[PDB]
CSV table of C-alpha atoms in Angstrom, one decimal:
chain,number,residue,atom,x,y,z
A,1,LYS,CA,0.0,0.0,0.0
A,2,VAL,CA,1.1,3.7,0.2
A,3,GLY,CA,-1.4,5.4,2.4
A,4,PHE,CA,-0.5,3.9,5.8
A,5,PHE,CA,3.1,4.9,6.2
A,6,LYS,CA,3.4,8.2,4.3
A,7,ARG,CA,0.8,9.4,6.8
A,8,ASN,CA,1.3,8.2,10.4
A,9,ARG,CA,5.1,8.0,10.3
A,10,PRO,CA,6.0,11.3,8.7
A,11,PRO,CA,4.2,13.3,11.4
A,12,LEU,CA,5.2,11.2,14.3
A,13,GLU,CA,8.8,10.4,13.3
A,14,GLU,CA,10.6,11.9,10.3
A,15,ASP,CA,10.4,8.6,8.3
A,16,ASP,CA,8.9,9.2,4.8
A,17,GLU,CA,10.4,11.9,2.7
A,18,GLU,CA,8.7,15.1,4.1
A,19,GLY,CA,9.4,17.4,1.1
A,20,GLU,CA,10.6,20.7,2.6
């Protein structure tokens, strides 16, 4: 999938590529 990691992780920890 791709809507269950790029969502909860990014906020919580800096996991997915934010974007800046």
